[PDB]
From Swiss-Prot:
Changing H25S: 55-fold reduction in binding affinity for Link domain of TNFAIP6. The lineage of its organism: Eukaryota, Metazoa, Chordata, Craniata, Vertebrata. Changing R8Q: Greatly impaired chemotactic activity and enhanced inhibition by heparin. The chain holds residues 22 to 88 of 93 of the full protein. This is SDF-1-alpha(3-67). Changing K27A: Impaired CXCR4 activation. The gene is CXCL12. The record marks H25 as: Important for dimer formation.
Length: 67
């Protein structure tokens, strides 16, 4: 419908600087054309952002959340 932005990955920019502290909630988007893009919602900013999978606090979360 558009051109190359819809079914593809929904995340574009990742806020690795984020930290579980200022993070309000966590969410994920199950896409086929892409992988599991973990989304989120920051507090200090009060907005939704894509968190990095290699984060220090998310590495523990993804560890228990995955397995």
């Amino acid at each position: 419908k558009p051109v190359s932005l819809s079914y593809r990955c929904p995340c574009r920019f990742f806020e690795s600087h984020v930290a579980r502290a200022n993070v309000k909630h966590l969410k994920i988007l199950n896409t086929p054309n892409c992988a599991l893009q973990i989304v989120a919602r920051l507090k200090n900013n009060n907005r939704q952002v894509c968190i990095d999978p290699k984060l220090k606090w998310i590495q523990e979360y993804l560890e228990k959340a995955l397995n």
